[model samples]
Target chain A: AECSVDIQGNDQMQFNTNAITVDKSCKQFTVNLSHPGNLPKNVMGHNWVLSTAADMQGVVTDGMASGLDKDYLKPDDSRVIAHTKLIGSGEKDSVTFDVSKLKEGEQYMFFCTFPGHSALMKGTLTLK
Target chain B: AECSVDIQGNDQMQFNTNAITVDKSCKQFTVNLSHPGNLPKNVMGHNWVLSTAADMQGVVTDGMASGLDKDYLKPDDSRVIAHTKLIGSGEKDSVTFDVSKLKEGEQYMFFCTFPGHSALMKGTLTLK
Candidate 1:
């Protein structure tokens, strides 16, 4: 629970988890996200993005304009703590973030930055 | 060409064709819409809805309120001349509408009413 998590996304545009916790004792946190559907990234693309709940909308708004080349994420955005690669259909990706970057009492969220996916494919992440 | 048209909707939330024509001689015109990806009806569901171009927006607006249980379509909506069953990836559905229902001078459109999908997943239908 402290070290890693695995999230699954499917063609239905949903993630397997709605909430996650990173144990405070861990120095680093890892996330392995996988897509289990049979669609191309250009069509049913998905990616995991981490940001404060306050910045989530701005991130998604700009990400929609950033295009798939940047994995639908704004490049060098300070609000983004970490994110995984854009993936689709059985493809997998992983990301590791230094736990120190996350602050206690901060409300954070992990969501798919794909153009229309963030509406449903997102969840809360807490530091425990 | 006179009796049937096949359209494909994929994970990209788009259709294969943007325009279709039905011959005037046709007593009945058929639309065969298919989804080739591996998704479910509730997630990436799609359906072909027919109406005059002017009524398209209202149809979609009410369909959104109609819920998925109604196949995202307002039940027995008179504005809807014909509609195919909602389908998912690897599934196909078809509709045959009486040619008499389409006026020669009226503009017609065929679109998928799956929540936000009509934005791009629609096409023009002409009676020639």
Candidate 2:
């Protein structure tokens, strides 16, 4: 896929992979998230959130406070570079971000902001 | 319904009541959990879990670690007097336990063990 990646979230509170590589040649990147679990969105909800590794916790904390009504992300939060909508079983959401914003050598992370889900549903992203 | 009580869980992270009384005249007690909000179980998952007031935190801690497959409960956890399956909005589940499991003088508590839900979705359960 052109500058795109597919991610899977399941009922077990896990992501399909823990590392994503973004080719430097790409001007934009897309993350397509899918939930294969049968649980409803409120129970086993998952969303793809992106931020610097350093900002991950802050982003998660604010998103936790933001609640599900905001898709677990604060409105117009600068710390969150990109994110997908909260989704449940058999559902999918996608987010596209300007690849130019990702700096080389800076560590990035993608995780779900569904309350405690970040404990296991997190992964690393790097501009290669 | 003499031995049963209905508890409602809504999108706002609250229960219908903060107190529940069980009459000793009943031999078996039942708890019925209903979600009136449209949120699914994962985002606002709710379940009725019963334990000694002293065991509430530990039960919740273990349940948080237990995840959803166990219905947010540790399998065969001794501290659990009873619990209902985790449910979502417009969904309902009930659990019945022998009233003998409760002690006359011991204080009991019923709460939702779905991650952070214990904070507001809990109530004191007393034997009358």
Candidate 3:
């Protein structure tokens, strides 16, 4: 279970969990993202986007400019470590990335790229 | 005041009140909207938009397509009775419109045009 975690977003613009830890033993880690509210994607869409903590703001800014058609992320953005597709309430998406990409002692962030959402819908992810 | 009222928006994606009244004696009415949350406008922006209750969904749909740059509304939309500028946490905006624009028996709705916000941030406004 240490290799995977479930995170949820709601109409309140919130991610239920504030932190996630991945054990060093896993070869790959999975993030399961879900939205439980009743709003549609265009109105209350949420996504799980991952990047280094330092790259969070930049990624969010660029993602907003990239528009929802790209799932609120820049096309082929190198700074994005991994991301799930934007989803509406009652919808879910998941993404798996190589655990090897996560460096020891480095801080990472997971957020929703929907315009104006990341400000409150972000959390920390780290190797435990 | 009979002609003026105040409302609030919050990070919780809600308006403090679900209904408002404008006395028949008022020639015009003012609505002051405020946000008390800590998030910035881009991440948790809110705006006050007015239209007929019947037009709410249509306006919300088109507003989402209009993007945040247009304050999440279609420009020059005739259906809009009034609107306030988008604001973030700890910010405030106000709009005043002629009471004549509202019909005595017609129902009006006030909502946030910020993408995804209207689904949860809306209320009834009426002449009493």
Candidate 4:
């Protein structure tokens, strides 16, 4: 099945699209994220992570304190369904995961876990 | 031989201090950065990178396109004199660098390269 998603990130702390849909025919889906800014990651790095709203705080908190070596994330976090490596301007990352893992009616939130960006960098996901 | 610098980064994209002094008697200087707010890295992920003002754009541009696997950095970039890993809410990071590596009057800057966070996340640096 053909299932692919593309989104844009700019120098602003905002994503082009706040909602994404995965085709039902596809058992696996892919997310492609791109940044069009020109700043370095140390200044405005961005990433894509998928998890439940409940797990977001814990993951974000632990990841925030984990330091840069861990990509500001807790390693192998079971709460994370998917995540893209952080990228700066003109960079991109893609992640693919099995759709079966998501339970119907359980909403998902996709966001950048960089630091204080989640305020404006979050989006909602619906798994059918 | 004691030079300790304390810096604060905020959710508003500002640094508490713009300049820091390293006591001449100290061979190595330490930079301590703290974030005093509640937020995740992706939303306001902030980092401190030190480099000659001349190399700032290139380093920032290259790091921006390098993707997050390298922390929005170009992977061991020689232009970087000192850097603190990216951090988020209520988090902190520290970096120590040899004062001898700095030229007495060379100008430097500390900035976050997350994406658009740099619009307000920059500061000047002077090595005494």
Candidate 4, B1-128: lDDT as tens digits? 25778888886567787766666677888888898876567556678888888998888888777766566778889998888888877999999998888777778887776555555677787755
Q: State which docking tier applies to candidate 2.
A: incorrect
CAPRI rating of model 1:
incorrect
Q: Give the 10-residue window scoring lowest on summed lDDT in candidate 4 chain B.
A: B112-121
Kindly report the TM-score of the first chain in candidate 3.
0.97
Candidate 3 collision pairs: A43-B116, A116-B42, A116-B43
lDDT of 2 at B105: 95
> What are the runs in model 4 whose C-alpha is more than 4 Å off?
B1-128
User: True interface contacts reproduced by each model, as a fraction?
Assistant: 0.00, 0.28, 0.11, 0.33
C-alpha displacement of B75 in model 2, angstroms? 16
Name the candidate, 2 or 4, with the larger TM-score value. Answer: 2
lDDT by residue for model 3 (A1-128), tens: 57889888987788989999989999999999899966678667899999999999999988876775787799999999999999988988989999999999999999888765677789998897
Between candidates 3 and 4, the TM-score winner: 3
Model 1 Cα shift for residue B86 (angstroms): 17
Write one digit per residue (lDDT tens) for candidate 3, span B47-126.
88999999988888898678777878899989999999889788898889999899988989989877667767888998
What is the Å distance of residue A5 in model 2 from its true position?
0.7
Taking the tens digit of each residue's C-alpha lDDT, what string does model 4 give over A1-128?
A: 25878887777778999987666677889989898966667556778899987888788777776645577788998999989988888888999999887887887888887766676788988875
Model 2, runs deviating above 4 Å: B1-81, B84-128
